[PDB]
Symmetry: C5
Subunit: 400 residues, 5 copies
């Protein structure tokens, strides 16, 4: 329009985009900085970066970009692209993107009284400490630090407005507790100008249904299945294979969780120590199986059962476990000849009776170690799982 063209010609006359738009050069410029969270795109534990979709909000006043709306009836708002007017050089301090600035340079909305409005969008990548001590029952506090790179406090003082969460798109994995901000001042030793900056702390809680279904319950079931070696009879000849196969499956499950864990050496993860305890339990079960197999295949005349072992296992353990114990010249030549066979059969019977005791002792040890290992596994799993804080909150929210 005629009035629009005339005003656009008038405004850019003698305008210097390198100048701070203030009436008094000795006074700072009040700039209001805010934020508008849209969605949490990705949280990467290994690289320790956070990716979010954010609309920034910067607002200030311009002394030169003013006009009387009566002389320009139709026009009430003008718009300028990047590079034609002065804008704050607000940057994200802790950035992980290749190019240090990720915002998209849109237009600037200027009212009739000299009020500007800049809302650039972008996909921001920032580096924050992602603790994995209580994984998967985690709560993370990631920070976003914004501030003017070059303008100090005598020139541009930053003010904070509350972050806008309306329009947030919920994430499937993470639950947003909140996002509170804070305006802080820095005092350089040179001078006496406060340096205002705005920091936003995004606090989120992981939803643990997926991990509980895919990593914890299957490992619990595999460890419980590993307990069956103490129920298999020793004559089957399959006791070792079960345990070693369970150990191999545990190694595979270990690599599965290792490929998603950061290499940080700050603390021992809950899942890591839980896997370690389960693996130790399986190994001890394998050792006990080896000992039981040694007891079962004992040589009948390779030694005598120790008195201490007898009084420990055969009677006391049976009492505790309620396991009952199991169980004419030719005439003389013919006589000696059949007596030899009778004595041989008697010796064989005695040897078998001796071996039965060793077999019973092996069975008793098997049952006792089954009981002990089941108790140990239950106690260790319950304690390790319950040690984590907000575990009750996590289970109540996710699984119910």
């Amino acid at each position: 329009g005629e009035f629009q063209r005339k005003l656009y010609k008038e405004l850019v006359k003698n305008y210097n985009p390198l100048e701070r738009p203030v009436a008094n050069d000795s006074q700072p410029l009040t700039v209001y900085f805010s934020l508008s969270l849209l969605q949490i795109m990705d949280v990467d534990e290994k690289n320790q970066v956070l990716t979010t979709n954010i609309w920034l909000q910067m607002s200030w006043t311009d002394h030169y970009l003013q006009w009387n709306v009566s002389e320009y009836p139709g026009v009430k708002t003008v718009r300028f692209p990047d590079g034609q007017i002065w804008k704050p050089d607000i940057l994200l301090y802790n950035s992980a993107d290749e190019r240090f600035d990720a915002t998209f340079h849109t237009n600037v909305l200027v009212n009739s009284s000299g009020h500007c409005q800049y809302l650039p969008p972008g996909i921001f990548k920032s580096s924050c400490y992602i603790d994995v001590r209580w994984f998967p029952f985690d709560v993370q506090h990631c920070k976003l630090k914004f501030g003017s790179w070059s303008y100090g406090g005598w020139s541009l003082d930053l003010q904070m407005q509350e972050a806008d969460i309306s329009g947030y798109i919920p994430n499937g994995e993470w639950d947003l507790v909140g996002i509170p901000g804070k305006r802080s001042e820095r005092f350089y030793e040179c001078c006496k100008e406060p340096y205002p900056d705005v920091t936003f702390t995004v606090t989120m809680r992981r939803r643990t249904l997926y991990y509980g279904l895919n990593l914890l319950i299957p490992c619990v079931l595999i460890s419980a299945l590993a307990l069956l070696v103490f129920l298999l009879p020793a004559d089957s000849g399959e006791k070792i294979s079960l345990g070693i196969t369970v150990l191999l499956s545990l190694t595979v499950f270990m690599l599965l969780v290792a490929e998603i864990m950061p290499a940080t050496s700050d603390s021992v993860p809950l899942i890591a120590q839980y896997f370690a305890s389960t693996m130790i339990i399986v190994g001890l079960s394998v050792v006990v199986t080896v000992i039981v197999l040694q007891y079962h295949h004992h040589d009948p005349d390779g030694g005598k059962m120790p008195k201490w072992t007898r009084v420990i296992l055969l009677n006391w353990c049976a009492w505790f476990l309620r396991m009952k114990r199991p169980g004419d010249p030719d005439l003389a030549k013919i006589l000696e000849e059949v007596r030899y066979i009778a004595n041989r059969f008697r010796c064989q019977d005695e040897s078998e009776a001796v071996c039965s005791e060793w077999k019973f002792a092996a069975c008793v040890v098997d049952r006792l170690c089954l009981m002990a290992f089941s108790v140990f596994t239950i106690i260790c799993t319950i304690g390790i799982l319950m040690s984590a804080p907000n575990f009750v909150e996590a289970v109540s929210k996710d699984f119910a």
Copy 2:
């Protein structure tokens, strides 16, 4: 051409690219927006990102770019590159790309009466919610929200037009259902002026032939082969090995499944329920195998058959499945010896009879659990696969 040179010189006289080209500055400017779907490239379920290839279509009227073809006999249309003509700042809010705007800036073609056309191509990466509750039989809706950034409702009247799919290239994995649009007006915390936008919803259906033939049929076959542990005679020593190797195969199959799905905690996937059911069935089969093996190797003279187990197994169950049960001092001394031998043989005979009874009981239990597990597996698989909606239509389209 001389006419082209003269018209190009005239058209840029006192032309401001920052000015909105309207005759009356109080009236809005009508802009028509539409899409042109060319190809669906990627549907990343893990990252919830959709990649498409579309041509945006924008049309409006420029008041200043008008001329009479009588004075310029040859030229009818003109083309202006980026930076020399006014263009709407329409961009995608759902953008998941590093650079927020992913369009290729091309020329703007203009009428002899001021009608401008703008068809910029580009590959768009948006973020839409992907539902995995019914994978691989899911239907996905993904939204694309287009609208002007710094221009309010009182400046441009964004008018929606029906999307064009006349040049769509069919995808081998996703079947397009449609792409309708809706134009709505929203308020924002920034300002006090409504901001219109145009949203297009892309509806796709996943073809299930590949996922079926590569995921479900092998699982069915392996789970069915796991049932062979009940037909294997206990005299062999490979039942436990069979069970554990099937468990390992299912574990690797589950890992391959888990490495393609998002880590959401909003629902339990159908494939996850199926895999859990199969794992539970195989685990209980292994437990039953352990029980049967312990029954078969039951040492005689170490406990009699309980009456309850006797009546349940050897009397009732064997009836049910129509399986039957299997089936002079020298002479005095010599007589004593042969009597001893005969008595020992008689005791051996009664012991082996008891052993045969125990083995028959083990076989009966094996047959019972074979039948029960077969019924359980069939029912569970059928129910889990038929629970999902549109399963019949998916099967029909992808197979028949």
Copy 3:
């Protein structure tokens, strides 16, 4: 030199890079387009993306860039960079790159009579449909569509020239068959003027030596190894272990090859059919092994075979396979004892004979199943491999 400087000053004056350089504005401008294929960089079957290194060849005539070499004795040609002279806006329609244009903008060489020559290079990524029906004996055709974006038929008369492959560098995996071109003009829903375009179809054949030696021969050899389970004597309890280990290895093989193929549900690939048939063969071998083991470990005095089973196995099939089937009162008291012992031995001998007859029946079944499975494996492999077209050509051109 002075003459070159003067000519450069003269040519630039009054020139407009926006106008179309034609003497008559009502006549179209003839532009010749051609390709120069240099290398095929990658064929991504997963993303259906083809990467090539080519040089575009564009040539036209400029009316305003003309001079007489007599007035400028030294200079014969001039070079203008991007943005200083008019250039056609020819770009690839079906681009798969984030930047829709991937051409390095070079200088434009100009005649002394107005002929312009443009040779921009670039690394082009194109989205072409890849058919995996006959993988790895398939032949692929990928299209490259070029044409002006904003210039219609009445303004820019595009023409086609045959592609140049004199500088082609052979690829290790893909063998080039040819690259023809076709020029056509279409109508678009935007406008009512035809828009011509030039399409180049790249036809190439996949070399099969690597895929053969790394996918087909190992599978054949391992299937033949799985066929060896029928020669194992039943006493050595390793048949189940052999079969299940082969099945596990082959599931691993199938799941590994599944990663280098698209998830298109358009057809069942040749390799998929091959591995499915091998799966069924090995599973049926395992089932047969279970049946044979069940027959071998039969319970004596548990029900004799049916006469039908006897005549089928030990009579007909044994002859068919040419197998030979194997095979004073004290005096009275001691007489009774010895008679009892002898009768017990006789009963033991009868039971042994029955067990041996069962074992021979099991061996006969084993031999029959070995023969049948060998025949089936050979037939299935040969049929599946020979069903694919171009198999003979691929073999005779790669292996021979």
Copy 4:
């Protein structure tokens, strides 16, 4: 303000950004260069690339950018963007990014007496040698070489200032030791003028808690578990299965470690030596198990124990490891028959005695090899682990 506007207009009058701001041309321009390390983002061992977040600090004196504060009461400092004033072209020589420069060009702050400050941020990828000889117990030094490109020693006088680490953010995986700098000038084949440069050496130490808990301890546990093969009785058939499964479980660990580490062929890594030692130990254990099994299943009547073997094993070893050592006409015909039966029984008893002697020899060999293998494993593990120069430091810092 009016004063700011006038000063900005005055300062850029007759200014030339291509000119070096020195009052006297024959003298160099002193520039002070320093660093500001924020955090260490990534250390890629396979690609040998270090990624850091740093701020450069360059300060120099400009002769033309001076003004009197009394004439401009408000403004005390001015700021300029890129292109409008002269800046040093200081680059990182050993860059690894696709773009050779990764800094983000910010504004330049100027005194009222002409003192320019430049603090451009960026994320820098630099290629530095990575030593994996003592991995994980290793300390790495990575160089960062900065310096002007086209300015020599007679034009630019680079001066080094100590690096700042007050803003450092500790990294979990790596522990920073220090960052000293060094300034030196070199000669290049291009030119006959020295070119000074500043090199900062970042020295960091790897924290070994994660690797210790995830890599070494499981390997020690599985290696110790492999020693159980010498305690199993030879009657069972699981020794070879145990050994080979342990070998597989170690092979996959070696696979993962080789995946983690680079393919440099300048030294044998400590973890590689450890894995080779474990491989050799397990293989030798399997060979010993095979030998012991061959000794156990010795055919009686098919050979005799050599005198050397007898004296070596059955006496000296049995003392050393303290193992007990286990071990009328009709009348004549009847007499002959019973004599035959008893004679065959005697022969069977002699064969059984020979078998028992062979079994005892096998047990003695098993025990001796268990002792020897335990000693070898412990000695080798301690020797390999203790050779790291900073093993004591790692143990006393991370674990303690």
Copy 5:
């Protein structure tokens, strides 16, 4: 400085960056081109690309950029940025980067007599044919072609200077043999002007310590381990498991080796044929083990030993292998009943002999096939390893 200010003002007056700075327009401009290699960043056999860090050296003479030093006493050099003076358009013909040009545009140094220097850095990703025929023992020649894109022989005379490697940083995997270069001319049919181009060939040698320690040694060790099945007694029942385990292990070796290699069909790699030979040897060992198990478990009544098998195995191979071959009415009724038992025992003793013969034959076969396979594996491995050229060179330079 005032002098350099006025010199910069004077030099750019009436300067056109579009023309060749030659005093005579008809005389070609001589340009000297060289290269300075610094690092071999990466070699990608799968993608057939080479990544290097390189400085380019271009030198020419500018006619218009001359001045008298006595007129400007303090100025001896001037520096110009991109787009301000004429520069050769030298490009890399066979680049593989997404952007065809991968150099960083630095300043151009001009001396007082018009001599220009240009040293742009960059990381170049070119494509070269990598031959994996003799992997790991490889020697690769990768080409780098540089030339002017749009300048002929009457315009540019591209001379050559030898490459500079004084600043080369040794790589940990590749040994730089050298970098020769050639200056080649191209003659066109149109014109008699040569078309100079400079190509540099990079000759590299792969250091084989890492590959020979991570691929060769474990393969030969596992292959030697696979020979223990013949030393294993057949009563253990684990030969099949050992063989099948080892085979399956070696597949997870061949597949993971093929993971890192290009899919070319130009030749069969040495590592591929070595792996194939090893797998074939293991498979034949498994078949022989099956045959030996068939011979061992031969029932005594299932036929008679073939005469040829007798004379061969029991005599010839036995002597050759030096294996020792092992080795009133009541009276009548009692007489018959004892003679029956005596005859039963006699028949059992007679039937044991043929079983012993079969077992001895199986042992002979085991020993003979162990002897054969031991030489087979050694011959195959040595021949395959020593077939490659410069294997002695690689060994002497890496291991020794």
